[PDB]
């Protein structure tokens, strides 16, 4: 305590110098620093390991000693600013610091091989290290000034990571939409911290906590100003944690890397909003209506995040909407006032879905050998099919992750969601059974994802489907030296060479002579099956498996750090109901464990597809059109600004530049007239 918090200012700045050296290396001497290709990787990993060990040491001192350190320095001293940039060590700082550092180290170990076949390598690790710098500075922040500072820097790093692969234009639309949405949240954080400075005059996390115990009891401040100030202060976490108004940036983040899917969300950056709301809960329990607003936004986005992940063709977008629905669970917990269970659910999701993203990217890099390089091919969860037979450790890691979200008590994570629903049902009956219903839906789509990825035949090398596969397996025909010397140019064999005559019909033969000329055999015959990725992909997945097994059982440390059977079996029953409904739909007949009489009766009861033909249509159109909110925002929010921009440059160039140009036009005209008069 005596000498370890005075050097707590380094944990933002320790990742920083390798993006500083890359930002002056790639920008000045690109052959030199790209010749030092893998060394900056290990240097970023080592500096983040230093920050990991120091954050673990601060966490050990937080669980031993109950104290908070606020090691503030001075930044500007001219007038009423007197600004500080200090570092606020609460238990939330320890949770967020280990949550950044462990996930960042594992994503960097992953990204050594994810980017190992990328021409863009070092600028990705510059963005990674500068993002880790910015987010660790965000969580070690003693005032809203520095929260605002590193908040916008995190938004910039999100822009850079999503538009990392800058040559593809869908990532360009993605990163523009992402940074603009983060700036719509930044907007609210601005006029929210300025509203708090007008209500308090604080600009510090220290004095807000001892002013908001009696600020609402005053007559000068308005309750309306406090609730609109707190709502605008919540607009920021809406944009970071991808809540219902500002959610349209999250599923477009897929076009960048898969490590940024593991780090922009299921990690640090969507935990920025959770960190902010949980840090400001001593001034969110005081303002009465904002708690209901946070509960309302969470309970609106949990039905949106659930129904979106039901019918995604993309693996990464589906896990993104799963991340958004779990972030809605976190905001629903933050709307409970639950100071403890919200952060614990944050920890277990941020170690669970990070593992799920690394498993998804291992699936993707295994599929790259099959389909070549394409996100509509190598990220399409439909034609993944089954990979249990091929990549087993990826299967085990992805399965432990999806059971960590499905809520399995012994060997996965369930106690978090148990505390969520336990704190939910004694609060308001409207919010509770729909939360359990979304939990059942969450188990449903996560098991749907697991079955479409790992369980069944491959859907791409399947001999019913691929014609090049049937041409490649059968190097010789079924007769050997008969029926052909091989036959190419197989003609229009409608009659099947049976000399079949025709009754009264429209036509049998015509002037149409079209031969189905098929492709050949014995050429690129191999079609190498998706083998396992190297050690740098499995090793973060093994460590995150050890996390999600270790955190999933956490006389407890629930109070010193910061209906028992019926509710638990109800949550497990509705989750296993989602398991069962996904299992009977996607798990094929040759590998399912169910009795074939019941399995036959599933299609026998439902062979009509008329009362299913509207339900599947509505759910798929919802998940495909993004609840039509993407189309409405691209119709009347950004194209409305485009029409406003064209109208405003019309008013500029035509009828205020028109007046100024018309002064000279009139002087020319009166000069030409009075010359000739």
């Amino acid at each position: 305590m005596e000498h370890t918090y005075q050097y707590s200012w380094i944990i933002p700045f320790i990742p920083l110098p390798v993006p500083i050296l890359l930002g002056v290396g790639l920008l000045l001497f690109p052959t030199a620093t790209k010749n030092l290709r893998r060394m900056w990787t290990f240097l970023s990993i080592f500096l983040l390991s230093i920050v990991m060990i120091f954050s673990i040491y601060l966490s050990i001192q937080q669980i031993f000693l109950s104290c908070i350190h606020q090691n503030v320095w001075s930044w500007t001293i001219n007038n009423e600013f007197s600004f500080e940039f200090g570092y606020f060590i609460d238990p939330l700082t320890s949770i967020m610091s280990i949550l950044i550092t462990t996930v960042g180290i594992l994503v960097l170990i992953y990204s050594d091989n994810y980017m190992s076949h990328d021409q863009g390598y070092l600028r990705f690790f510059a963005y990674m290290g500068f993002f880790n710098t910015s987010m660790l500075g965000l969580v070690t922040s003693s005032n809203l000034i520095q929260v605002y500072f590193f908040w916008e820097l995190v938004g910039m790093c999100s822009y850079l990571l999503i538009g990392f692969w800058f040559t593809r234009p869908i990532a360009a639309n993605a990163c523009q939409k992402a940074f603009v949405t983060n700036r719509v949240g930044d907007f609210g954080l601005l006029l929210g911290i300025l509203g708090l400075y007008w209500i308090t005059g604080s600009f510090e996390f220290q004095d807000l906590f001892e002013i908001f115990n009696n600020l609402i009891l005053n007559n000068r401040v308005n309750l309306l100003f406090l609730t609109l100030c707190a709502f605008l202060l919540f607009v920021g976490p809406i944009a970071k944690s991808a809540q219902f108004p500002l959610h349209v940036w999250l599923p477009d983040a897929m076009e960048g890397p898969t490590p940024i899917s593991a780090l922009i969300h299921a990690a640090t950056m969507v935990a920025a909003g959770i960190f902010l709301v949980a840090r400001l809960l001593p001034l969110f329990i005081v303002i009465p209506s904002i708690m209901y607003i946070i509960s309302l936004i969470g309970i609106i986005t949990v039905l949106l995040g659930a129904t979106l992940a039901l019918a995604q063709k993309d693996i990464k977008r589906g896990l993104a909407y799963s991340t958004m629905s779990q972030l809605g669970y976190m905001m629903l917990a933050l709307g409970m006032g639950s100071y403890r269970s919200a952060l614990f659910h944050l920890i277990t999701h941020a170690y669970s879905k990070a593992l799920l993203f690394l498993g998804s990217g291992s699936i993707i890099h295994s599929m790259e050998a099959i389909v070549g390089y394409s996100p509509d091919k190598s990220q399409n969860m439909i034609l993944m099919g089954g990979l249990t037979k091929h990549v087993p450790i990826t299967k085990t890691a992805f399965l432990i992750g999806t059971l960590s979200l499905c809520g399995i008590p012994p060997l996965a994570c369930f106690w978090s969601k148990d505390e969520i629903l336990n704190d939910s049902l004694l609060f308001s009956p409207i919010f509770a059974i729909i939360a359990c219903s979304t939990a059942g839906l969450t188990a449903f789509y996560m098991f749907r994802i697991y079955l479409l990825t790992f369980e069944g035949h491959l859907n791409t090398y399947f001999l019913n489907y691929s014609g090049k596969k049937s041409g490649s397996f059968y190097s010789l025909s079924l007769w050997g030296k008969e029926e052909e010397k091989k036959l190419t140019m197989n003609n229009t064999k409608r009659a099947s060479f049976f000399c079949n005559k025709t009754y009264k019909i429209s036509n049998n033969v015509r002037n149409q002579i079209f031969i189905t000329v098929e492709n050949f055999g014995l050429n690129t015959r191999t079609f190498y099956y998706p083998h396992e990725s190297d050690n740098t992909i499995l090793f973060p997945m093994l460590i995150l498996v050890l996390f999600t097994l270790f955190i999933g059982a956490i006389n407890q440390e629930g109070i010193d750090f910061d209906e028992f059977l019926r509710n638990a079996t109800f949550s497990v029953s509705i989750a296993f109901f989602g398991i069962f409904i996904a299992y009977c739909l996607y798990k094929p007949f040759y590998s399912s464990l169910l009795n074939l009489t019941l399995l036959n009766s599933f299609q026998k009861w439902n062979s009509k597809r008329i009362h299913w033909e509207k339900l599947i249509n509505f759910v798929y159109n919802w998940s495909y059109n993004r609840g039509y909110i993407d189309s409405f925002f691209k119709t009347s929010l950004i194209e409305s600004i485009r029409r406003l921009a064209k109208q405003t440059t019309f008013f500029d160039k035509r009828i205020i530049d028109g007046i100024t140009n018309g002064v000279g036009i009139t002087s020319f005209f009166v000069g030409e007239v009075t010359k000739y008069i």
Partner: protein
């Protein structure tokens, strides 16, 4: 220099002549100049996506950032006027570097508008990374001087003795829409002239990148922006005494 220093005189004169020579009529019309600056930021930030031209977007971007100077001058406060001086120096660097890089981008690519001139960032990555970082400096995005400039302008609004809450809420709201509109045109410029891929541009052109001279220009403007964006007393400390001497005439 037309945008770096020639644009900021006058705004200098609004501090020099129109603020210490004529205090009471400046107190009369700064209610109107505040509203005109708030309309200025939104108006010029919305005329910028309407510009197909590259360099005109940066021109109206300069008109947009002058609104913070007009507001900080009209904010009858030390944080207002001091953020105005900071925005003078900050956007001197910002406009100078952006118009420099736009001139060099026109010299390389030879394409003026933005319906053409698609993905060029693989062709000129040094110009792309400097133009990207200086766009971030234009975004009032931190580690850069425009951030702390506009935030001290906001702080001068919110700590005003001239204005009441009815005005201040509207002023903060309209100004804070401007830092949403500014990413729209800046990142539209970035995704037009740099992001993307044109199939015809593979090896036959093979454009020359930023040379070391132009790269020193961009880095040497970038370094004081960063040095002020992380330690803003490189501007406020050389003028806060004089701004106290100015506002001594206004607060009595």
């Amino acid at each position: 220099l037309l945008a770096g220093i020639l644009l900021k005189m006058g705004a200098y004169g609004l501090v020099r002549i129109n603020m210490e020579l004529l205090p009471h009529a400046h107190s009369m019309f700064s209610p109107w100049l505040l509203v005109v600056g708030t309309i200025q930021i939104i108006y010029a930030a919305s005329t910028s996506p309407g510009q197909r031209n590259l360099k005109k977007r940066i021109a109206y971007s300069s008109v947009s950032h002058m609104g913070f100077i007009i507001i900080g001058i009209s904010s009858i406060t030390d944080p207002g006027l001091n953020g105005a001086i900071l925005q003078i120096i900050s956007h001197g660097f910002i406009g100078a570097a952006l118009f420099f890089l736009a001139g060099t981008s026109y010299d390389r690519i030879r394409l003026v508008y933005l319906d053409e001139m698609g993905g060029m960032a693989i062709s000129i990555p040094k110009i792309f990374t400097m133009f990207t970082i200086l766009s971030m400096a234009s975004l009032a995005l931190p580690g850069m001087s425009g951030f702390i400039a506009e935030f001290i302008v906001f702080f001068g609004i919110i700590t005003s003795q001239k204005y009441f809450l009815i005005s201040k809420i509207f002023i903060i709201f309209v100004m804070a829409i401007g830092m949403i509109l500014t990413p729209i045109y800046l990142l539209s410029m970035l995704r037009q002239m740099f992001y993307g891929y044109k199939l015809i541009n593979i090896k036959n052109f093979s454009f020359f990148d930023s040379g070391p001279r132009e790269l020193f220009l961009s880095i040497s403007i970038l370094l004081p922006i960063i040095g002020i964006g992380i330690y803003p007393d490189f501007v406020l400390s050389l003028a806060s005494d004089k701004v106290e001497s100015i506002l001594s005439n206004y607060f009595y």
